[PDB]
């Protein structure tokens, strides 16, 4: 969950990451706005935001080279199919926060 996030994210390629935290404010805006809203109502009611969350990880993957190299390694599209319950979705929301904390520790 959070133990493998320190080794898989560090093992990359060339140093000096050109990607910061401002250019990734688009795909990281729906992940934080989903964990705090799925606990109020049921999971079968919100059927428009679930299908739209997968689109953000596809349209933004073919524009910048600093996006495709991270999704294929962290397996983001693989966990989008296993989830189906409200309790399972709560676990995926916590895994996204691990890829951001360890990213700013080695650089920015």
């Amino acid at each position: 969950k959070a133990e493998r996030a320190i080794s898989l994210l560090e093992k990359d390629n060339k140093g000096n990451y050109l990607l910061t935290t401002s250019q990734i404010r688009k795909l990281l805006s729906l992940c934080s706005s989903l964990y705090d809203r799925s606990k109020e109502r049921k999971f079968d009611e919100l059927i428009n935001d679930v299908s739209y969350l997968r689109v953000q990880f596809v349209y933004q993957a073919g524009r910048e080279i600093a996006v495709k190299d991270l999704i294929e390694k962290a397996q983001i599209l693989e966990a989008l199919k296993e989830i189906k319950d409200r309790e399972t979705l709560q676990r995926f929301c916590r895994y996204m926060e691990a890829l951001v904390a360890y990213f700013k520790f080695y650089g920015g």
């Binding site: 133990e3 926060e97 951001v100 700013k104």
Partner: protein, 251 residues
């Protein structure tokens, strides 16, 4: 500082036991002379009563019930914490590191009845006997270290090398330390999540501050990461060191 006070009850150990047969080391001499035990209790009785008033200079205190067993100190906590561990350093050199010492610093509120204020500060010494014989408690019954370990780790580098590093980031950034003492609270929940969350709120204190001095946060960032991820029992030293710095500069 605020309107608080500390109550410490210093009580030396290794006194009631090993007092009559503690001089045996050679089969030649008997080591049972009554004069040998008379000068043993008289030499220590001079330090816990007469020498206490000598070391009380340049400080506002009020000794209560002076004796060679258990004493009672009260006053402003701005120096009792530093004077309690300082008085023990003079007893180790006097005995060449052979007799341990214990105490119990306890903080309470202002204008409190002595019937319960002086009674709750004595339970910290009894609760510290779970390890062996050299331990002390701070606020609650959780900070039960090894007494002498408080000066060799917490007061050593965790307290001296922080008085001038974060002091420049005070006032304008005093609220940035509140999130550090609270993050270490929920520890028995999940261990993997407690480590990843700490790596996020710590890196934000390097770019927000002044980047003109590189040696301002580099020495504090390296020590904070090693003092937290090294041992399970070592995390209590960094938690208590950061809590005492908040009460230092306050009001």
């Amino acid at each position: 500082g605020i309107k608080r006070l500390a109550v410490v009850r210093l009580d030396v150990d290794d006194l009631g036991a090993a007092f009559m047969a503690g001089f045996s080391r050679q089969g030649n001499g008997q080591y049972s002379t009554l004069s040998r035990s008379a000068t043993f209790s008289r030499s220590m009785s001079l330090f816990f009563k007469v020498y206490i008033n000598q070391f009380a200079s340049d400080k506002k205190l009020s000794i209560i019930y002076a004796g060679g067993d258990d004493v009672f100190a009260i006053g402003s906590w701005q120096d009792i914490i530093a004077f309690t561990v300082e008085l023990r350093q003079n007893f180790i050199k006097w005995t060449n590191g052979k007799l341990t010492l214990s105490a119990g610093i306890g903080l309470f509120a202002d204008k409190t009845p002595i019937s319960l204020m002086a009674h709750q500060t004595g339970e910290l010494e009894e609760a510290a006997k779970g390890n062996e014989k050299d331990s002390i408690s701070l606020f609650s019954s959780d900070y039960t270290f090894k007494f002498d370990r408080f000066i060799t780790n917490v007061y050593d580098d965790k307290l001296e090398q922080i008085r001038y590093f974060f002091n420049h980031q005070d006032e304008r950034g005093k609220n940035f330390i509140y999130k550090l003492i609270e993050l270490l609270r929920n520890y028995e929940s999940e261990e993997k999540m407690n480590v990843a969350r700490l790596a996020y709120y710590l890196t934000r204190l390097e770019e927000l501050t002044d980047k003109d001095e590189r040696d301002k946060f580099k020495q504090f960032k390296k020590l904070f990461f090693k003092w937290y991820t090294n041992n399970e029992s070592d995390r209590k030293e960094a938690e208590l060191a950061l809590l005492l710095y908040v009460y230092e500069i306050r009001k």
